[PDB]
């Protein structure tokens, strides 16, 4: 409720000066208060207060009166103010897992919107990560498995969400290297590369999770061993995302990412059948994976991309992640990863996701677990309803972005689905696939509403 209230009231914060100083004073007093769960809200206030305003801060007894002093503001003083208010957050990283979660999630926007603090946020992240990453020539489990777990009172919980940390430093390094350049950022990517090249070579027995050892949901070692699998799961996802973009297009990185997905999928198979969480792929990366995997056909990429295209399970994984993002948008108006609260970026990305899923279904119904085509059609079914529910004034722009007024475009789409429905209904029964016809009828309803 404090996060939602502050987000709602921040337009008044944007244009004022007395209000911002009052909030700063309240949050500063709340930080030093020894009562816990007060810091849990103080940091949540500070992230919003800092990731939206470039300059903040100013320019009692009865016997004292405030007076106006006409000193024009000193930029270096304000920069030192920001640096101190961020150093407080730097030493706030010895708390429970939720504060670490929201700090890791807010640092990317803090770096993006206040460019001056660039060379200190990364000296926070890089100096925190090295508590776990273990640099040597060869020690096969390169990330420390147990260093982020706690054992007090036999109520085992995790403190350091290592996956979220590594994701945050990944996005921070991407924004640093790609955009705002015109040797710490030269060392950090080498650290990341030495994480990949010794994580794909993990036997998965060097995490001591080789066989289905305990994995229970009730015992002592079981819950900890379960929690110590989601960390490596998220690390594998984020490392896939980075190793896509470390180099433009070469087969070596693609052998790396495919083998690392194999090491993800083996663990997911082991963990799933015995007894989940969301994925860590950024939304724009999901779109740039789908579009670059199905649609584009430039001959230079083809040699390397044939390796990633031949993994049938990888296709299902990618479309499942896209479907998960669409589902999260359907439930609430924010996707998980970055740009989650910015609606226009989600709309622009969703346009491309629709444009590529439509091509995948329509272009190749050759002979049609579940097949890929049904997953694509289910994604269309979810995403049209999402568009109609949330992006109401932009339906015309959405229909303009696919490849005259809205009604002719919608008639064309309904004809496209119409012909396929007729084609798969014309077959004699013999267990005809009724799921596709049923959800096609659902899509036709949701589209004929237009």
């Amino acid at each position: 409720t404090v996060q939602r209230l502050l987000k709602a009231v921040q337009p008044l914060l944007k244009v004022s000066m007395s209000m911002r100083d009052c909030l700063i004073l309240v949050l500063r007093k709340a930080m030093f208060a020894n009562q816990l769960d007060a810091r849990k809200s103080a940091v949540a206030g500070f992230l919003l207060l800092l990731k939206n305003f470039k300059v903040l801060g100013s320019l009692l007894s009865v016997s004292q009166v405030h007076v106006d002093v006409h000193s024009h503001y000193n930029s270096v003083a304000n920069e030192t103010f920001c640096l101190e208010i961020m150093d407080s957050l730097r030493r706030c990283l010895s708390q429970q897992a939720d504060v670490r979660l929201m700090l890791y999630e807010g640092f990317y926007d803090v770096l993006r919107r206040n460019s001056q603090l660039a060379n200190s946020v990364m000296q926070t992240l890089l100096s925190q990560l090295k508590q776990f990453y273990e640099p040597k020539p060869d020690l096969l489990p390169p990330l420390k498995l147990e260093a982020c777990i706690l054992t007090q009172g036999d109520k085992i919980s995790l403190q350091e969400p290592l996956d979220y940390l590594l994701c945050c430093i990944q996005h921070c390094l991407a924004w640093y290297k790609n955009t705002v350049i015109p040797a710490f950022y030269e060392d950090l990517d080498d650290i990341l590369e030495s994480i990949t090249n010794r994580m794909i070579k993990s036997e998965l027995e060097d995490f001591e999770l080789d066989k289905s050892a305990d994995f229970s949901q009730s015992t002592s070692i079981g819950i900890k061993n379960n929690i110590c699998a989601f960390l490596v799961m998220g690390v594998c996802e984020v490392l896939i995302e980075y190793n896509f973009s470390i180099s433009s297009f070469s087969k070596n990185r693609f052998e790396d990412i495919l083998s690392l997905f194999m090491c993800y999928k083996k663990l997911s198979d082991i963990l799933n059948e015995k007894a989940t969480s969301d994925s860590l792929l950024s939304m724009k990366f999901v779109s740039s994976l789908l579009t670059a995997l199905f649609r584009d056909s430039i001959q230079s990429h083809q040699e390397s991309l044939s390796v990633l295209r031949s993994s049938n399970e990888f296709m299902r994984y990618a479309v499942n992640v896209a479907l998960q993002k669409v589902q999260q948008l359907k439930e609430t108006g924010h996707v998980s990863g970055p740009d989650g609260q910015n609606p226009e970026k989600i709309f622009q990305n969703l346009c491309d996701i629709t444009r590529v899923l439509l091509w995948r279904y329509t272009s190749i119904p050759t002979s049609v677990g579940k097949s890929i085509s049904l997953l694509c059609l289910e994604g269309l079914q979810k995403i049209f309803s999402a568009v109609q529910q949330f992006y109401q004034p932009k339906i015309q722009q959405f229909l303009r972005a696919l490849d005259v007024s809205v009604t002719q475009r919608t008639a064309f789409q309904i004809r496209q689905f119409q012909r396929s429905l007729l084609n798969l209904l014309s077959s004699q029964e013999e267990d005809f696939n009724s799921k596709e016809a049923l959800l096609l009828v659902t899509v036709l309803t949701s589209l004929s509403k237009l």
């Binding site: 004022s16 300059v55 009692l60 007076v67 106006d68 002093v69």
Partner: protein, 596 residues
């Protein structure tokens, strides 16, 4: 309350005072003279008889009369008191305002200074007296902004004068209670009250050890008081009218007096009959400051209600007729604007000043148009008459001696006029309708980044001069924030504007929202030979075409003549002006129509 925007129409540099001078301070180490102008500007002059142009700089931040100044801290700092209810602390060497104290609630009238404690105190018409350690004020910064006060109580009425002694052990106040009230500034305890004087006291002095007091009064007398005996030991009645200003030499034996009767006397306190007529000034004397380089003082500076400041030389004391007849140095002053008439277009203004010069100004462009010389003012008003009515949309005041224009929410947007009737051409061939106040508001804030929309800067028809001061104050008293038009792009100025600009200005300047229109109901009836309503700017021609249609361009105008109160109406005249100038009855305007 309700926030008004104002601005002053003036030149970028006013080297000379534009009004009288209320107070003077002389810095002996740098030979610099400070004048506290009634025109709200403090100016620093050089008193070197070398230079021909003694002007050095102006310090402009005050908004109204500057009533007193005191040079503090061995001449580094001057503190000033003004009728805008604030006290400001200036760096006197660089000439900028460092702090503004706002604890007073009415006109601050008098300031006092105790050199040996480097202590100053302020007092005014609000009956409060605050004591301030100057070094605490100078230690103020943007973080350490806390100041704490100590004040004296007992005073029953508005304070008009105030003096402290050099040791800072006695303070005396003068007021309309006629009694002067005395406190110990070190303990704030009330001390004795000496009653006896019968009128206001505008001039007070104490000897170095606070044992004698001189009071000057509007009853025309000077009185000498012993504080050790608590009584009057001599009364001097050397003036015919009120005494407004007193000075005394270091030996406390000769008193220099001046006031409403323009005459300045030097009287020996031990032997009154030995007295010297020093001079007769050209205007009531308001304040004097001796140069004290040498024991028998060489000269006395004299402030009057006129804009000129005269230095008079003092040959000596040993010897009806004035000792001196012409000033020794003269700092020239300028004219004040004393009379103002707003013309019928509600766009131009005619002025008269104290030199009987007449000028013509452009309120919209915030500048002068032509000097018209010493023509007769009322004949010039009658010669520049145009039969047009425009609703009132601003007010003018001459309190500072310059033209100050004030805009209020109640009527700022009342005046729509056509581009054609204005001096703004029709480059696309047509003239739409402009709201004057909204254009002015957009010009004043042209440099404020928040009004810039995705690039346009301003309104596209005119600029104001970049140096025009723009002041945001509350109605009745308290100025909130003052800046120059060109300075709006600063980050500090933009922050304070965002904090201070009222929503009713934001409406026009930011959202680009059109103000409400105004419609006029009127009657049409066959007494030239139905209840309708239209825009107040609609031309008679449009009603003529209306009538032509409903009773079936060039032919309409040729055939139908429109009348009001039996007078033939000019088809180009609009309904608003007709109603204002011709309708002399009550209830709704009634027009009679006919066919010819």
């Amino acid at each position: 309350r309700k926030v008004q925007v104002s601005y002053v129409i003036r030149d970028e540099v006013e080297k000379y005072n534009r009004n009288g001078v209320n107070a003077l301070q002389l810095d002996p180490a740098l030979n610099r003279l400070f004048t506290a102008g009634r025109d709200s500007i403090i100016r620093i002059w050089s008193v070197n008889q070398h230079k021909q142009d003694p002007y050095i700089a102006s310090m402009e931040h005050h908004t109204d009369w500057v009533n007193d100044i005191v040079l503090c801290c061995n001449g580094k700092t001057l503190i000033s008191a003004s009728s805008d209810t604030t006290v400001k602390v200036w760096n006197a060497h660089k000439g900028f305002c460092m702090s503004t104290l706002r604890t007073h609630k009415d006109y601050v009238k008098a300031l006092a200074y105790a050199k040996d404690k480097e202590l100053v105190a302020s007092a005014g018409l609000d009956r409060q007296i605050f004591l301030w350690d100057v070094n605490t004020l100078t230690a103020l910064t943007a973080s350490n902004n806390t100041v704490t006060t100590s004040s004296l109580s007992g005073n029953k009425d508005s304070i008009y004068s105030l003096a402290m002694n050099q040791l800072g052990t006695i303070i005396v106040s003068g007021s309309t209670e006629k009694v002067l009230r005395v406190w110990d500034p070190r303990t704030c305890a009330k001390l004795m009250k000496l009653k006896g004087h019968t009128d206001n006291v505008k001039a007070l002095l104490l000897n170095r050890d606070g044992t004698q007091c001189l009071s000057g009064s509007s009853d025309g007398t000077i009185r000498l008081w012993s504080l050790g005996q608590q009584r009057c030991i001599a009364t001097y009645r050397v003036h015919d009218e009120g005494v407004w200003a007193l000075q005394v030499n270091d030996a406390f034996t000769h008193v220099y007096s001046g006031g409403r009767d323009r005459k300045i006397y030097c009287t020996d306190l031990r032997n009154p009959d030995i007295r010297v007529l020093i001079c007769e000034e050209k205007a009531p004397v308001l304040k004097m400051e001796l140069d004290r380089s040498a024991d028998p003082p060489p000269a006395i500076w004299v402030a009057t209600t006129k804009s000129t400041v005269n230095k008079w030389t003092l040959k000596g004391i040993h010897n009806i007729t004035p000792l001196c007849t012409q000033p020794d140095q003269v700092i020239k002053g300028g004219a004040s604007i004393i009379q103002c008439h707003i013309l019928n277009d509600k766009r131009h203004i005619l002025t008269k000043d104290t030199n009987n010069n007449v000028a013509y100004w452009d309120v919209l462009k915030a500048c002068k148009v032509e000097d018209l010389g010493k023509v007769d003012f009322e004949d010039e008003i009658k010669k520049r008459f145009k039969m047009v009515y425009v609703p009132n949309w601003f007010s003018v005041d001459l309190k500072t001696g310059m033209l100050t224009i004030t805009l209020d929410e109640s009527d700022c947007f009342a005046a729509w006029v056509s581009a054609k009737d204005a001096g703004f051409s029709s480059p696309d061939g047509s003239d739409p309708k402009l709201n004057l106040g909204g254009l002015l508001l957009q010009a004043l804030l042209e440099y404020w980044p928040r009004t810039h929309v995705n690039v346009q800067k301003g309104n596209g028809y005119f600029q104001v001069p970049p140096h025009t001061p723009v002041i945001f104050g509350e109605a009745g008293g308290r100025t909130l924030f003052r800046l120059l038009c060109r300075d709006s792009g600063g980050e500090t100025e933009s922050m304070l504007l965002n904090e201070t600009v009222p929503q009713w200005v934001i409406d026009i300047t930011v959202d680009k929202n059109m103000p409400k229109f105004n419609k006029i109901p009127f009657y049409l009836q066959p007494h030239a030979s139905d209840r309708l309503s239209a825009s107040d700017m609609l031309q008679v021609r449009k009603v003529m075409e209306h009538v032509y249609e409903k009773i079936i361009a060039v032919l309409a105008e040729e055939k139908i003549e429109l009348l009001c109160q039996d007078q033939v109406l000019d088809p180009n005249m609009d309904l608003r002006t007709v109603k204002h100038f011709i309708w002399k009855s009550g209830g709704d305007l009634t027009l009679h129509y006919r066919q010819k």
